[PDB]
């Protein structure tokens, strides 16, 4: 067979960052070369494993987690980096093995008048430990006055809506991001290259 990268890259729907979509890929043959030589990807940055050296070296199972961020926020998808997205929405561990493929999607994910489908978390009381998602939409308490769950003074909505337009700045165009992550366990190497 072949590893099913078609329905994760060319998919028609990408999830927001506060609910980044996770897909477990295993028990297939890897063809990462097509990923590297496509030349349609704006950014393709790989840590731990060299892009030309991952074709032969293989693992047990990979996780492809995809989302949509701003253009200027794609620098934050990297180990040991700060910011709103890298702290409250998607944080990678310092010991990272997978890597990031981000390509512009201004002709798909941006619509004139404001594409408000994509959201990102802005406020929360604690930082994110690596590789997990929080979906809870409870109004957090900014001050010392309890808001009793209802929204009001000193208690803000954690989520904020992206406004994506085709005429935004090149640093604000909606970038579709996929992240590959590899793990080592006692399981045999199911996914390997040709």
């Amino acid at each position, epitope marked *: 067979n072949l590893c099913p990268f078609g329905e994760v890259f060319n998919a028609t729907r990408f999830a927001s960052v506060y609910a980044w979509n996770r897909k477990r890929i295993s028990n297939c043959v890897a063809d990462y070369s097509v990923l590297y030589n496509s030349a349609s990807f704006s950014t393709f940055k790989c840590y731990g494993v060299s892009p030309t050296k991952l074709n032969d070296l293989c693992f047990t199972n990979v996780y492809a987690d995809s989302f949509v961020i701003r253009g200027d926020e794609v620098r934050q998808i990297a180990p040991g980096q700060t910011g709103k997205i890298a702290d409250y929405n998607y944080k990678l561990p310092d010991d990272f093995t997978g890597c990031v493929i981000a390509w512009n999607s201004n002709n798909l994910d941006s619509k*004139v008048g404001g594409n408000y489908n994509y959201l990102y978390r802005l406020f929360r009381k604690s930082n994110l430990k690596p590789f997990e998602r929080d979906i809870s939409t409870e109004i957090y308490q900014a001050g010392s006055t309890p808001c009793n769950g209802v929204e009001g003074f000193n208690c803000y909505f954690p989520l904020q809506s992206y406004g994506f*337009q085709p005429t935004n*700045g090149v640093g604000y165009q909606p970038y579709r991001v996929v992240v590959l992550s590899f793990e080592l366990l006692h399981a045999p190497a199911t996914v390997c290259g040709p």
Partner: antibody
Amino acid sequence: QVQLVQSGAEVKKPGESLMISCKASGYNFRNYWIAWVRQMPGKGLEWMGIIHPGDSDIRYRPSLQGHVTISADKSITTAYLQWGSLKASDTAMYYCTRITTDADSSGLFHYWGQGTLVTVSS
Amino acid sequence: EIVLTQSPSTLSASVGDRVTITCRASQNIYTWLAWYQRKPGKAPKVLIYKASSLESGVPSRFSGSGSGTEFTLTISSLQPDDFATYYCQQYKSAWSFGQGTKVEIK
């Protein structure tokens, strides 16, 4: 200096085919959005569509999705507006504007062409 | 869809007078308002962008102020070249213009 020059005014019969051009010079035609704005008599300014040469990305308003067609020819660096079939309500003043792009914004109509009156009558 | 209003629609003063033009928004536009000057039968020219920034080449008499939903255009000293019509165009969501304000001599 950025210069946009359009054609002269047209007077056409309804149902005909009309193509109105706008020539852009003074900048790189392949890296700046150009938008078409229509000002019907008795109404305020109102955009119709945008086109970005280089990506061939053309977007119209929801109301005018299938009535007008925007096109570009980067060899001569002109932007074309064509009607499949002119109607009686298409009489207006048509502008071509080069959008200066600003972050977290819809872009700014910065430089304007001289405009071109189009009149439809029998 | 965002609709904007200008007050007053018509306003006339003499040379050197102080002219204040108010543009009001239906919803919140932050500061994404640009002010244009349009001569009769001529393409409009941008005067203010980001609601407070002067464009290169425009005389410093024009000034922009305000934020949120209340915006103000102020002309420090009216002069013969200032006589034209003005549009306040927002670009936060989709480009939309006001009804315009026409000024003339008194």
